[PDB]
Amino acid sequence: NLVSDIIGSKKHMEKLISIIKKCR
């Protein structure tokens, strides 16, 4: 269920992370 979206958030999140320090 949408519970997956939460997980898939981690997804775009990890990219967001790889991004965070990237963009900083």
Swiss-Prot record:
BP GO annotations: defense response to bacterium
Effect of residue 23 to S: Loss of dimerization
Subcellular location(s) of the protein: Secreted
Gene Ontology CC: one annotated term: extracellular region
Chief localization: secreted
Tissue/organ expression: Expressed by the skin glands.
Residue(s) carrying Arginine amide: 24
Coiled-coil segments: none
Protein's UniProt keywords contain Isomerase: no
Keywords: Amidation, Amphibian defense peptide, Antibiotic, Antimicrobial, Disulfide bond, Secreted
Domain of life assignment: Eukaryota
Function: Antimicrobial peptide. Active against Gram-negative bacteria E.coli ATCC 25922 (MIC=1.5 uM) and P.aeruginosa ATTC 27853 (MIC=23.2 uM) and against Gram-positive bacterium S.aureus ATCC 29313 (MIC=11.6 uM). Has no hemolytic activity. Associates with and disrupts membranes in vitro.
Oligomer status and interactors: Homodimer; disulfide-linked.
Entry protein name: Homotarsinin
Organism of this sequence: Phyllomedusa tarsius
